[PDB]
Scaffold this motif. Structure first.
Motif, PDB file in Angstrom:
ATOM      1  N   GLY A  23      19.779   0.692  10.915  1.00  0.00           N
ATOM      2  CA  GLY A  23      19.455   1.222  12.223  1.00  0.00           C
ATOM      3  C   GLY A  23      19.633   2.724  12.381  1.00  0.00           C
ATOM      4  O   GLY A  23      19.624   3.223  13.498  1.00  0.00           O
ATOM      5  N   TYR A  24      19.784   3.450  11.268  1.00  0.00           N
ATOM      6  CA  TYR A  24      20.033   4.893  11.355  1.00  0.00           C
ATOM      7  C   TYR A  24      18.771   5.697  11.156  1.00  0.00           C
ATOM      8  O   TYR A  24      17.964   5.387  10.303  1.00  0.00           O
ATOM      9  N   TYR A  25      18.628   6.783  11.916  1.00  0.00           N
ATOM     10  CA  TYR A  25      17.444   7.622  11.779  1.00  0.00           C
ATOM     11  C   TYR A  25      17.364   8.278  10.405  1.00  0.00           C
ATOM     12  O   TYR A  25      18.319   8.906   9.950  1.00  0.00           O
ATOM     13  N   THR A  26      16.171   8.190   9.826  1.00  0.00           N
ATOM     14  CA  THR A  26      15.896   8.510   8.431  1.00  0.00           C
ATOM     15  C   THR A  26      14.481   9.036   8.365  1.00  0.00           C
ATOM     16  O   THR A  26      13.683   8.834   9.297  1.00  0.00           O
ATOM     17  N   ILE A  27      14.124   9.742   7.295  1.00  0.00           N
ATOM     18  CA  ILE A  27      12.743  10.168   7.117  1.00  0.00           C
ATOM     19  C   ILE A  27      12.438  10.232   5.627  1.00  0.00           C
ATOM     20  O   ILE A  27      13.367  10.251   4.813  1.00  0.00           O
ATOM     21  N   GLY A  28      11.159  10.283   5.263  1.00  0.00           N
ATOM     22  CA  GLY A  28      10.777  10.554   3.877  1.00  0.00           C
ATOM     23  C   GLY A  28      11.097   9.367   2.980  1.00  0.00           C
ATOM     24  O   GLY A  28      10.787   8.210   3.305  1.00  0.00           O
ATOM     25  N   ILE A  29      11.702   9.666   1.831  1.00  0.00           N
ATOM     26  CA  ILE A  29      12.085   8.646   0.862  1.00  0.00           C
ATOM     27  C   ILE A  29      13.584   8.348   1.036  1.00  0.00           C
ATOM     28  O   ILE A  29      14.428   8.745   0.244  1.00  0.00           O
ATOM     29  N   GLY A  30      13.925   7.660   2.134  1.00  0.00           N
ATOM     30  CA  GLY A  30      15.318   7.323   2.379  1.00  0.00           C
ATOM     31  C   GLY A  30      16.232   8.491   2.689  1.00  0.00           C
ATOM     32  O   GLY A  30      17.425   8.399   2.412  1.00  0.00           O
ATOM     33  N   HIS A  31      15.703   9.578   3.244  1.00  0.00           N
ATOM     34  CA  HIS A  31      16.593  10.670   3.606  1.00  0.00           C
ATOM     35  C   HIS A  31      17.278  10.409   4.952  1.00  0.00           C
ATOM     36  O   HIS A  31      16.636  10.496   6.002  1.00  0.00           O
ATOM     37  N   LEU A  32      18.569  10.115   4.925  1.00  0.00           N
ATOM     38  CA  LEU A  32      19.327   9.841   6.159  1.00  0.00           C
ATOM     39  C   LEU A  32      19.450  11.105   6.965  1.00  0.00           C
ATOM     40  O   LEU A  32      19.862  12.142   6.439  1.00  0.00           O
ATOM     41  N   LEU A  33      19.071  11.044   8.241  1.00  0.00           N
ATOM     42  CA  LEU A  33      19.202  12.233   9.082  1.00  0.00           C
ATOM     43  C   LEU A  33      20.517  12.255   9.827  1.00  0.00           C
ATOM     44  O   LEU A  33      21.185  13.314   9.912  1.00  0.00           O
ATOM     45  N   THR A  34      20.899  11.119  10.405  1.00  0.00           N
ATOM     46  CA  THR A  34      22.133  11.063  11.193  1.00  0.00           C
ATOM     47  C   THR A  34      22.464   9.626  11.489  1.00  0.00           C
ATOM     48  O   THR A  34      21.580   8.758  11.516  1.00  0.00           O
ATOM     49  N   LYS A  35      23.737   9.365  11.739  1.00  0.00           N
ATOM     50  CA  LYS A  35      24.132   8.031  12.162  1.00  0.00           C
ATOM     51  C   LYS A  35      24.258   7.976  13.669  1.00  0.00           C
ATOM     52  O   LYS A  35      24.564   6.921  14.243  1.00  0.00           O
ATOM     53  N   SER A  36      23.977   9.104  14.308  1.00  0.00           N
ATOM     54  CA  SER A  36      23.959   9.162  15.774  1.00  0.00           C
ATOM     55  C   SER A  36      22.818   8.353  16.355  1.00  0.00           C
ATOM     56  O   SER A  36      21.703   8.378  15.835  1.00  0.00           O
ATOM     57  N   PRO A  37      23.075   7.657  17.470  1.00  0.00           N
ATOM     58  CA  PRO A  37      21.979   6.956  18.150  1.00  0.00           C
ATOM     59  C   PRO A  37      20.955   7.851  18.856  1.00  0.00           C
ATOM     60  O   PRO A  37      19.951   7.361  19.358  1.00  0.00           O
ATOM     61  N   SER A  38      21.187   9.155  18.854  1.00  0.00           N
ATOM     62  CA  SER A  38      20.299  10.086  19.544  1.00  0.00           C
ATOM     63  C   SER A  38      19.109  10.519  18.680  1.00  0.00           C
ATOM     64  O   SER A  38      19.291  11.159  17.641  1.00  0.00           O
ATOM     65  N   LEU A  39      17.895  10.199  19.112  1.00  0.00           N
ATOM     66  CA  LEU A  39      16.712  10.696  18.431  1.00  0.00           C
ATOM     67  C   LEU A  39      16.691  12.230  18.468  1.00  0.00           C
ATOM     68  O   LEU A  39      16.229  12.889  17.518  1.00  0.00           O
ATOM     69  N   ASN A  40      17.185  12.818  19.557  1.00  0.00           N
ATOM     70  CA  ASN A  40      17.171  14.286  19.603  1.00  0.00           C
ATOM     71  C   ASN A  40      18.078  14.889  18.527  1.00  0.00           C
ATOM     72  O   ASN A  40      17.746  15.912  17.920  1.00  0.00           O
ATOM     73  N   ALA A  41      19.222  14.261  18.302  1.00  0.00           N
ATOM     74  CA  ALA A  41      20.133  14.680  17.240  1.00  0.00           C
ATOM     75  C   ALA A  41      19.445  14.553  15.880  1.00  0.00           C
ATOM     76  O   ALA A  41      19.559  15.459  15.035  1.00  0.00           O
ATOM     77  N   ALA A  42      18.731  13.449  15.664  1.00  0.00           N
ATOM     78  CA  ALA A  42      17.979  13.289  14.412  1.00  0.00           C
ATOM     79  C   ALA A  42      16.890  14.348  14.234  1.00  0.00           C
ATOM     80  O   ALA A  42      16.712  14.869  13.144  1.00  0.00           O
TER      81      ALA A  42
END
Length: 164
Positions: A23-42
């Motif tokens: 459930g964590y925001y990620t992009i690309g080939i599994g690049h974790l952006l943040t464990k924050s629930p905020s899309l803005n933070a991601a």
């Protein structure tokens, strides 16, 4: 097969921000952006990682650049970790890819806690290691991927990834 092809199969490629298996925001080939629930933070993390205002979307070249950085970071993390480095150095090239895969997915600290499995791997007790590795939250939460990585450690071949 090599570590890039292996993780590209396991992580996929998505050019817009998505949520990973946890459930964590990620992009690309599994690049974790943040464990924050905020899309803005991601989105802020994304812009910082890429160096431009992305508005949640990147190019394939940008995804591959993050991936190169992330694979390098996983390998460096292993080589700097006193519990992981000796086991990694003991492994053949195919099994080293399985090791990198685990560190990419769960991070260096997380794998370094797999104490009993690491010992079995260092001892080349492959079937025993395979059984132990499956006794894990990792296996139960992502069983198809864990089965591939475990088969790679068990056999020292790419049989689980052929053919994709």
């Amino acid at each position: 097969m090599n570590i890039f092809e292996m993780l590209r199969i396991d992580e996929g490629l998505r050019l817009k921000i998505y949520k990973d298996t946890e459930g964590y925001y990620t992009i690309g080939i599994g690049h974790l952006l943040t464990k924050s629930p905020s899309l803005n933070a991601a989105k802020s993390e994304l812009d910082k990682a890429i160096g431009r205002n992305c508005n949640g979307v990147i190019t394939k070249d940008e995804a591959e650049k993050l991936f190169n950085q992330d694979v390098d970071a996983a390998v460096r993390g292993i080589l700097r970790n006193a519990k992981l480095k000796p086991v990694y150095d003991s492994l053949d090239a195919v099994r080293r890819c399985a090791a990198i895969n685990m560190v990419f997915q769960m991070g260096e600290t997380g794998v370094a806690g797999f104490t009993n499995s690491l010992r079995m791997l260092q001892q080349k007790r492959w079937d025993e290691a395979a059984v132990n590795l499956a006794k894990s939250r990792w296996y139960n939460q992502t069983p198809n991927r864990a089965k591939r990585v475990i088969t790679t450690f068990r056999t020292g071949t790419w049989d689980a990834y052929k053919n994709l």
